Design a protein around this ligand. Structure first.
Ligand SMILES: [C]O[C]1[C]([O])[C]([C]OP([O])(=O)[O-]P(=O)([O-])OP(=O)([O-])O[C][C]2O[C](N3[C]=[N+]([C])C4=C3N=C([N])[N]C4=O)[C]([O])[C]2[O])O[C]1N1[C]=NC2=C1N=[C]N=C2[N]
Ligand SMILES: O=c1ccn([C@@H]2O[C@H](COP(=O)(O)OP(=O)(O)OP(=O)(O)O)[C@@H](O)[C@H]2O)c(=O)[nH]1
Ligand SMILES: [Mg+2]
Ligand SMILES: [Mg+2]
Lengths: 96, 185, 498, 1140
RNA sequence: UUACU
């Protein structure tokens, strides 16, 4: 029964969400004060906002629980299609 | 991080798949310190990454302002990392310790070094048939389980509030009951 | 819990779940019901919705957010002296357990906490609510089955009246088992339906009816045609279709089961027709019932006309679902046909052949076939091309409004004054919706019948019946409300008549 | 003779069935047959169904015939016929003969309308029943005579065709002619054949002209033989003989454009086609099954009830569609994942409308104030705010029947659409949010109409300019009907298959839980983990009730036979976009799957309007063009049929040969039928100015259309009726009669208000705040006249310059004075109009409605609304709006968020009425405003204007003419842009359209509700720039007053930084992109045309301010532009004012 | 008396 990882993650997911350890808020501070609007950083603010994604409460609790879960199905990465063309593309390396 | 032995599971005689049950807690408990020794590791990474993006900007002769507004962003991740590492290394790390002692979390996951680790592949062999492996890439998704999203570290670093970053409101840190994750296990 | 079990104890008594007599969990179930008297008041104060449910849900569920200008944060301040009053080391927790009777009876102020809680969900097997889980097992009365093997003493199996209740599974009388076997002071759960485990062509099939073991016969190991009429009126075959029960199938075992509850999403769609039949405003309301060809509904909705007309005091009449096909074969040729209501009903069931069963019959020949076992030898895409060929004789009667078309027939039968006020048409295939006229109430009937088993049954079935069930299933998806034939018999009763 | 003495009633014209359940099916003459007024009468008694029939057919003849936009019916017909006197200077034009012969009875008009008793009441009972439509047809043809589309002798051929349609049924005959009478240009373009056209570039500037020979190919020449037989018999033979001359006589591509717009206005009168909707229920929203049935999916998963949960297609028409669409389910599940839906619920449950309900008995048990609020979507959610998390909320609204809203268009037949209540709106919302994110992914899921100007057509202008292309533009016919439930399922798989990979917790009254799921090819239930999106979508997909139920005054409650598409749900624009995108793109996967090429270029689908573009040989493209038809033919759709070489349509905008043809008749000036937001106000003139600007590039003579909009502005929109009270009626008369005449009205028993109406003099038709309409040349003192204001004149603070233009601006600079002539403004009456401006009647009527409603009852209701949503910290937006204002300066109301929670409630108090007790304290406050401002008046001049008083002096040396003007010299790049006209020369001299501006504006409105003209006012964008340019360090703070996300913040900032080249906040002007389609946005293009001697550059913004001076006076005075280059002189106070 | 993009 290779669906058994789906139970043991779900037990570990229900522990993290019951501990009240990370609560997502609706305020975004990806950039310091008045660099957002500053013309030279227009190439940089597009790379950060494309990668960063809204903080769904369901998957932050999943990523914590996957760390001590047993891995039965071999995990694989979301296909990140980036270029590493401009020097604003360090956002993907800081992501890693 | 460090490598904690599962002293609470073996004394409770839980099933483990190893000889020494050792899970890898991602970062140390850091009480009583002024400078956080997990946050200062990220200082030396950005200070290394500032010189990498410095060479790439000046080799390809871009603006003075585009190089400055890059490095002003690299130390805005410095400020936001200092504010939340007080809550990772005090309240996340005690959860990864107590999730490691659960009943069904029986395999080892990591052993310190990226250069040498592979998970111990047990199979169910048979003299009169094929062997069925335990860990096996078969693509059997559990509706989002095998695909791993690396864009999850941007909501963790920026747009989440923690029960210790908020200190200044009264919180009363939640210690959950043992009986729910015990009875499911 | 979502609904407290001391002020509202009879609902848990309906599930087989009796409240343990009056300690760290006996004290905690009184603590949780004290919150519901506080919570309910708060969502009076401002109708209905208690205000800031996030700081509410981070108090009951989590031992969290002690709070002390104000009137905004008044109900929070009154509550932080109430939950820090009783000393708990963690939260209280929720307990919806996944039941359309139980989920409908959750009050408004509990449901607003469900978004911000991560509640604990207890999965119902078929109903009963099945008794694990330190919540459900330390709060009240883990029960004891009392089948034909564990007889006959409470001292024998080491039971106690304060911990275990008893589930009658003897087949004996209820009153004697707590008379001579010593089960006095042992309270007994009450179930008023039953569950049947039939034999099948494919395997063990578990269906349930909401009749008690006395109300119908069939025990144990009687066939499927004995009291078939009561099973169709009240049964659900809880199995993925094809379930595969047949007229030669028998019973394996019988246990009393909870009376299942009808479908709040599918009660109200059928309740539109049971309002439009009543009001003198709506001229000629119409109920449209889709099913497969072998659902056995012409024997079913012939008596639902008999249950509605006796309750409404009106005259209803069902059009018997094939009355296009029987009628068009009779007068393909006739320039002015008689659209009268009395001519249609004195024509069908059964001796007049259907028009599509002429067309299907001719077609099966062309890809030459006459045996049902020969139809299994054919396979899917080679079959499906036959279904596509079968369609083009469908659309010739659906497209335009000619004088022999389907659109003209269901119009002039429905209008012309000889007809009854509220006819029930039944359709086989979906996208007959542009033809039946005119309604706001189309349901979808799923009976206790593996319909393709009934077409190898039919007993002058042949391939013509079985090709068209297969053709119509290709045209009938479940894009309407499934209606489950006991629920139409349930909704007549609920409705309040004059 | 069917008009001069019509027949009797003939009660077999509107028959019934054998019962009185519905009208006879397949009945013809479904609209209002011309039968001569007298004959309808009731005979028998107030019951017995047929009485309610003759009573409601009386509502068809007496009520549903008038729809006058501004004035009453007779004032509007006089507005053409007076303007048509003034322009052509005589009265020998033959439209007035149709005014005389169709109706004249020698004492009084044949019919008038009541307004107070709401019906058209007749004065001759022997006159035709259909005649109140023929006012509007004589209105529209005279609009077309004035526009220059039709000449006088052509309007004879027009009017005879309309009266020939009126012999038996004036609209039923028109709807059959509507298809034939405009399909004929593809023959005339074929016959013309070789025709010299402009071409366009990728980035829509004109780069070349080539002569490309239009001969449409061999397989559409076979469609000419079939169509010309239907042209011969379905048409009136003089209307037919006008067409057959336009095939034979036409010599250029410009020449077919002359006849086509002129033959189009012969088939339309702009009258919105209104009958009682029981007649059109059979025609409009009855579901048709065109030929094929659509088969079902293999259901893979089902929950405890046997219903569709996960499903996949098997070799059908849908399997072609999911070959394209199922690839997107892995990406959209991260965009439909990352919205938090409860937030997006309250922002989509804006636009206050109806719920179905009349609340009920519980309207008493919520309050008598919120009784009257109970129409809006945002209020009916607030009353039932407690029920939003219970799953029985949606179950109790399957019981509620869907009510048929009707709305009608210009040329389509009377159409119905379904007004869903808040819970049936809820189930359709998750399929709306899933199908929304395919728009950003795929270009070809395409254009929303935020451009208004050339960028809505800048796709179609390019591909027609190219070689070896055939263009097809497909309408399916009726696309509400056709969507049976089975065809609807192809969108349902795409909405399911996204929701499984996604992770949405709770969504609403759900939660991610542990369901019993049947897994097909398993025996036995195995419990998957489903999220709320999954559950919601499955329930909605399963449960779907489609019927619309209209309560009738004739019948009991007629209910549409379901199986249509109930087009109001939430996804009524995505369900027909995502579907047809899957079928046509999925075709070129299936054609590539079996060895055929694709040969299809970009395709633009706004559902239902399909428009694809092909390339190759004339044989290869046609092998693909059949299969795009044949798969839509086997999807159960009736594609009508359209294709051609060099012809393409989309969103009712024809593009051909690289030129833009207009469709002028669709903007009917004088029919509204809205019964919502009626103005007889300042706002009634804004409804003229917006529709006059719709027709500026659909006209062959925009100067004549300015003549028409003036007199209808003058004659019709002249009188504002106000109910004072008696004591104040005396002095309201005396004060306002000092300046402009006010009509007085005959006194009242026993209502205690006399009516009285003011007369709003002709200067108020030219004011900056009143009627913003462009003027004619006035007289100065000596008098050498002003410049004639053309159609490109911009509005707002520029019409205040026209006041200074009369005072001789050149003279003023001579004497060095900001002084003003009170003589010349009082003589025309400019002084009597700015008083009416300063009285400020409109917000005063809004102030008394704002005065009456208790804000305490609003606040308890609106605190309960923010309980459903965010949850917390919508408070931080109210805090950000208030922190910004007290520290700085006012950021106003509609824009910032939680005020625009409060403002969305407010509109039902705005709706639910003026009535009389509130109207008596209108007059008490206004009379206090009157006696203060009448006590003396002089023209109030502001320190904030120096800032006109600049005048251009013509010189003796010419401009260059921008080499794309040689390319658009021929042939007729728009209608008014014919060679040597005002709009062509403005496109030559002013020149160009940049891509750089209105891409960012096309990027701005993707935030904020795009589907139409979106003219530049945009109260986010102007208010944010006034903080950005002068002021911004605060600009962090009001972005969270928008609650603009980080992506949404990035859009606006790039538009602010580009809007810092041009222009000034300090000098306001407004034009619309509908007003100037191909003309440039930028005042940068006009600085090439005016030298400024550089001692005038005297402030930091002052280069960017002088451009607008050069920008407008070219567009204002374009009818007096020889092609000289003008030069700017300034008043030294204007030099002195900008220094600061 | 009145829908969504
Ligand atoms: C308070 O007050 C008010 C107002 O004012 C009104 C209005 O009136 P109007 O509309 O203005 O009228 P007009 O339109 O203007 O007129 P003309 O068009 O001009 O001419 C006339 C005519 O008309 C008539 N008349 C008719 N009718 C029917 C009527 C008349 N008059 C009167 N007065 N009345 C009537 O009915 C003739 O014949 C001629 O011809 O109104 C008012 N409103 C009203 N009502 C109401 C109101 N509001 C509110 N509510 C109410 N209920
Ligand atoms: O108010 C409106 C107007 C139009 N629509 C739009 O109408 C579309 C369905 O209407 P159709 O566009 O399919 O009508 P039809 O062309 O087949 O009718 P004919 O010209 O042949 O006479 C829908 O797909 C939708 O998007 C609305 O939803 N609402
Ligand atoms: Mg269409
Ligand atoms: Mg359309």
């Amino acid at each position: 029964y290779p669906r058994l990882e789906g139970i043991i993650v779900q037990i570990n997911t229900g522990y993290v969400a019951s501990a009240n350890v990370i609560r997502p808020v609706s305020e975004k501070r990806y950039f310091p004060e008045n660099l957002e609007q500053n013309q030279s950083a227009a190439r940089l603010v597009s790379a950060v906002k494309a990668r960063a994604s809204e903080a769904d409460i369901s998957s932050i609790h999943l990523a914590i629980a996957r760390e001590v879960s047993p891995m039965f199905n071999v995990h694989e990465l979301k296909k990140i299609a980036e270029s590493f063309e401009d020097p604003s593309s360090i956002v993907v390396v800081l992501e890693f | 991080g460090f490598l904690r032995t599962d002293d609470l599971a073996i004394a409770a005689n839980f099933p483990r798949a190893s000889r020494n049950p050792q899970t890898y807690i991602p970062y140390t408990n850091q009480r009583g310190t002024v400078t956080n020794e997990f946050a200062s590791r990220f200082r030396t990474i950005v200070a290394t990454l500032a010189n990498v993006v410095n060479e790439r900007a000046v080799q390809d002769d871009m603006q003075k302002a585009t190089r400055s507004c890059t490095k002003q962003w690299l130390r805005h991740l410095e400020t936001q990392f200092d504010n939340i590492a007080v809550a990772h290394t005090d309240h996340l790390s005690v959860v990864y310790a107590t999730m490691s002692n659960f009943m069904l979390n029986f395999t080892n996951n990591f052993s310190g070094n990226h250069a040498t680790f592979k998970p111990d592949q047990y199979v169910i062999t048979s003299p009169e048939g094929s062997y069925k492996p335990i860990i096996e890439r078969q693509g059997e998704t559990v509706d989002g389980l095998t695909i791993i999203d690396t864009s999850i570290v941007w909501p963790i670093l920026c747009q989440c509030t923690y029960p210790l970053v908020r200190q200044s409101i009264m919180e009363e840190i939640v210690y959950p009951d043992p009986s729910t994750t015990l009875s499911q296990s | 819990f979502a609904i407290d079990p001391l002020k509202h104890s009879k609902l848990y008594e309906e599930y087989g779940l009796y409240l343990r007599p009056h300690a760290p969990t006996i004290r905690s179930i009184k603590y949780a019901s004290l919150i519901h008297s506080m919570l309910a008041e708060h969502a009076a104060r401002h109708n209905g919705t208690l205000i800031n449910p996030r700081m509410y849900a981070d108090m009951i569920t989590l031992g969290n957010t002690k709070v002390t200008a104000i009137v905004t944060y008044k109900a929070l301040t009154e509550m932080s002296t109430l939950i820090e009053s009783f000393r708990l080391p963690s939260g209280l927790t929720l307990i919806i357990f996944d039941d359309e009777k139980y989920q409908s009876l959750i009050p408004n102020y509990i449901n607003q906490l469900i978004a911000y809680t991560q509640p604990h969900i207890i999965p119902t097997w078929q109903g009963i609510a099945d008794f694990s889980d330190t919540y459900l097992r330390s709060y009240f009365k883990r029960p004891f089955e009392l089948t034909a093997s564990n007889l006959a003493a409470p001292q024998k199996h080491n039971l106690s009246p304060m911990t275990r209740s008893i589930f009658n599974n003897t087949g004996r009388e209820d009153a004697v088992i707590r008379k001579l076997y010593g089960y006095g002071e042992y309270v007994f759960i009450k179930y008023e339906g039953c569950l049947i485990t039939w034999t099948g062509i494919y395997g063990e099939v578990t269906m349930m009816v909401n009749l008690s073991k006395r109300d119908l016969g069939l025990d144990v190991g009687d066939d499927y045609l004995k009291e078939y009429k009561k099973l169709l009126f009240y049964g659900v075959i809880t199995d993925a279709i094809p379930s595969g029960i047949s007229t030669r199938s028998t019973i394996m075992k019988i246990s009393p089961h909870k009376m299942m509850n009808p479908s709040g999403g599918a009660l109200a769609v059928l309740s539109k027709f049971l309002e439009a039949v009543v009001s003198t405003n709506v001229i000629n309301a119409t109920l449209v019932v889709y099913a497969e060809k072998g659902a056995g509904k012409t024997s079913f909705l012939s008596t639902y006309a008999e249950q509605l007309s006796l309750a409404s005091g009106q005259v209803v009449g069902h059009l018997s679902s094939d009355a296009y096909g029987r009628w068009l074969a009779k007068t393909k040729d006739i320039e002015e046909p008689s659209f009268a209501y009395d001519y249609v009903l004195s024509l069908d069931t059964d001796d007049n052949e259907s028009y599509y069963e002429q067309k299907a019959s001719e077609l099966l020949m062309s890809h030459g076939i006459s045996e049902v076992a020969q139809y299994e030898l054919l396979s899917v895409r080679k079959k499906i091309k036959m279904m596509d060929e079968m369609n083009e004789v469908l659309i010739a009667q659906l497209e335009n409004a000619d004088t022999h078309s389907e659109r003209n027939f269901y119009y002039m039968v429905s209008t012309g004054k000889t007809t009854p006020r509220i006819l029930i048409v039944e359709g086989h295939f979906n996208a007959q919706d542009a033809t039946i006229a005119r309604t706001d109430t189309t349901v979808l009937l799923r009976t206790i019948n593996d319909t393709t088993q009934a077409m190898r049954d039919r007993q002058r079935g042949g391939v013509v019946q079985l090709f068209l069930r297969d053709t119509y299933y290709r045209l009938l998806p479940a894009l309407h409300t499934t209606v489950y034939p006991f629920e139409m018999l349930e909704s007549i009763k609920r409705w309040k008549w004059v | 003779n069917e008009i001069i003495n019509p027949k009797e009633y003939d009660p077999s014209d509107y028959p019934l069935a054998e019962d009185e359940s519905f009208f006879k099916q397949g009945h013809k003459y479904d609209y209002l047959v011309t039968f001569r007024a007298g004959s309808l009468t009731n005979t028998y008694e107030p019951k017995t169904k047929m009485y309610k029939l003759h009573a409601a057919l009386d509502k068809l003849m007496h009520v549903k015939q008038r729809k006058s936009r501004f004035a009453d019916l007779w004032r509007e017909l006089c507005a053409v016929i007076a303007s048509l006197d003034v322009w052509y200077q005589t009265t020998n034009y033959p439209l007035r003969t149709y005014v005389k012969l169709l109706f004249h009875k020698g004492d009084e008009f044949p019919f008038y309308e009541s307004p107070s008793q709401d019906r058209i009441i007749f004065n001759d009972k022997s006159v035709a029943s259909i005649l109140p439509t023929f006012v509007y047809t004589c209105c529209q043809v005279g609009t077309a005579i004035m526009s220059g589309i039709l000449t006088h002798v052509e309007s004879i051929v027009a009017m005879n065709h309309f009266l020939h349609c009126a012999k038996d049924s004036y609209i039923d005959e028109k709807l059959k002619i509507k298809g034939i009478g405009r399909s004929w240009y593809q023959e005339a373009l074929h016959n013309v054949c070789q025709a010299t056209v402009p071409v366009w570039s990728q980035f829509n500037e004109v780069i070349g002209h080539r002569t490309k020979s239009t001969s449409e190919p061999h397989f559409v020449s076979s469609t000419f033989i079939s169509l010309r037989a239907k042209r011969a018999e379905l048409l009136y033979p003089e209307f037919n003989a006008y067409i057959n001359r336009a095939i034979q006589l036409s010599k250029t591509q410009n020449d077919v454009a002359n006849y086509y717009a002129a033959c189009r206005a012969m088939t339309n009168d702009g009258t919105f086609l209104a009958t009682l909707t029981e007649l059109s229920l059979d025609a409009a929203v009855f579901p048709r099954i065109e030929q094929h049935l659509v088969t079902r999916p293999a259901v893979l998963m089902s929950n405890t009830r046997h219903e569709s949960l996960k499903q996949k297609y098997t070799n059908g028409v849908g399997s072609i569609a999911q070959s394209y669409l199922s690839s997107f389910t892995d990406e959209i599940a991260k965009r439909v994942n990352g919205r938090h839906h409860d937030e997006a619920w309250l922002n989509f449950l804006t636009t206050s409308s109806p719920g179905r309900k009349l609340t009920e008995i519980e309207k008493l048990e919520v309050g008598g104030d919120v009784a009257a609020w109970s129409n809006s979507r945002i209020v009916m959610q607030a009353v039932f705010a407690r029920e939003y998390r219970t799953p029985e909320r949606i179950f109790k609204s399957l019981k509620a029947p869907i009510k048929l809203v009707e709305r009608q268009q210009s040329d389509r037949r009377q159409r119905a659409i379904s007004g869903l209540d808040n819970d049936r709106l809820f189930l359709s919302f998750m399929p709306y949010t899933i199908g929304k994110q395919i728009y950003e992914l795929n270009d070809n899921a395409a254009q929303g109409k935020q451009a208004g100007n050339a960028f809505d057509i800048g796709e179609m202008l390019y591909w027609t300019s190219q070689r070896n292309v055939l263009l097809s533009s497909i309408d399916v016919a009726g696309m509400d009907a056709s969507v049976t439930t089975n065809t609807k399922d192809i969108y349902n798989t795409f909405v399911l298959d996204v929701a499984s990979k996604c992770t949405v917790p709770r969504f609403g009254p759900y939660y991610a839980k542990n369901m019993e799921v049947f897994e097909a090819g398993n025996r036995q239930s195995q419990v998957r983990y489903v999220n709320a999106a999954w559950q919601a979508c499955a329930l909605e997909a399963a449960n779907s009730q489609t019927s619309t139920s209209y309560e009738s005054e004739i019948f009991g409650q007629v209910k549409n036979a379901e199986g249509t598409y109930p087009s109001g749900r939430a996804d009524t624009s995505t369900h027909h976009t995502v579907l047809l995108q899957g079928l046509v793109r999925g075709n070129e996967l299936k054609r590539a799957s079996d060895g055929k090429n694709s040969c299809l270029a970009t395709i633009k689908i706004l559902g239902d309007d399909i428009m694809e573009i092909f390339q190759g040989s004339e044989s290869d493209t046609y092998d693909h063009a059949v299969s795009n038809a044949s798969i839509l033919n086997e999807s159960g759709f009736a594609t009508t049929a359209e294709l051609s070489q060099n012809s393409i349509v989309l969103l009712q905008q024809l593009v051909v040969n690289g030129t833009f043809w207009g469709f002028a008749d669709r903007i009917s000036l004088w029919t509204r039928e809205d019964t919502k937001d009626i103005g007889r106000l300042n706002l009634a003139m804004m409804e003229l100015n917006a529709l006059i600007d719709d027709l500026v590039f659909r006209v062959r003579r925009p100067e004549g259309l300015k003549m028409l909009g003036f007199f209808c502005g003058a004659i019709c929109l002249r009188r504002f009726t106000l109910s004072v009270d008696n004591k104040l009626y005396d002095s309201t008369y005396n004060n306002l009669s000092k300046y402009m005449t006010l009509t007085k009205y005959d006194k009242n028993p026993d209502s205690d208000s006399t009516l009285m109406s003011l007369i709003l003099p002709l200067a108020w038709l030219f004011m900056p705040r009143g009627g913003e309409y462009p003027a004619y040349p006035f007289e100065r003192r000596d008098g050498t006249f002003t410049e004639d204001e053309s159609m490109f004149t911009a509005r707002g603070a520029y019409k205040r310059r026209l006041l200074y233009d009369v005072s001789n601006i050149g003279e003023m600079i001579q004497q060095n004075s900001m002084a003003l002539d009170d003589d010349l403004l009082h003589e025309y009456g400019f002084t009597g109009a700015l008083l009416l401006i300063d009285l400020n009647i409109l917000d005063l009527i809004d102030e008394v409605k704002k005065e009456d409603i208790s804000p305490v009852k609003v606040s308890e209701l609106a605190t309960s609304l923010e309980q459903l949503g965010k949850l917390g910290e919508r408070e931080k937006s109210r805090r950000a709006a208030s922190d910004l204002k007290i520290r700085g300066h006012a950021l106003s109301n509609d824009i910032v968020y939680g005020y625009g929670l409060q403002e969305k409630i407010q509109k039902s108090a705005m709706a639910t009425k003026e009535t009389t007790v509130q109207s008596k304290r209108v007059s008490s406050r206004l009379h206090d405003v009157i006696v203060a401002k009448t006590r003396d008046y002089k023209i109030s001049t502001i320190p904030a204007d120096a800032l006109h008083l600049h005048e251009f002096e013509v010189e003796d040396v010419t401009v260059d003419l921008l080499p794309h003007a040689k390319h658009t010299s021929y042939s007729s790049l728009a209608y008014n842009m014919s060679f040597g006209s005002d709009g062509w020369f403005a496109f030559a001299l002013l020149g160009g359209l940049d891509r750089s501006a209105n891409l960012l504006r096309l990027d701005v409105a993707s935030i904020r509700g795009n589907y139409h003209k979106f003219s530049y006012d945009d109260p986010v964008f102007k208010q944010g720039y006034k903080i950005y340019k002068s002021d911004a360090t605060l600009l962090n703070d009001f972005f969270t007053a928008i609650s603009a996300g980080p992506k949404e913040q990035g859009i606006l900032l790039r538009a602010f930084a580009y809007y810092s080249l041009y222009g000034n906040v300090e000098y306001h002007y407004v034009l619309s992109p509908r007003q100037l389609f191909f003309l440039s946005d930028n005042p940068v293009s006009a600085e090439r045309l005016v030298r400024i001697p550089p001692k005038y550059y005297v402030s930091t913004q002052c280069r960017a301010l002088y451009n607008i001076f050069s920008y407008l006076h070219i567009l204002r005075s374009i009818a007096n532009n020889r092609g000289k280059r003008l030069k700017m002189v300034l008043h030294p106070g204007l030099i002195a004012y900008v220094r600061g």
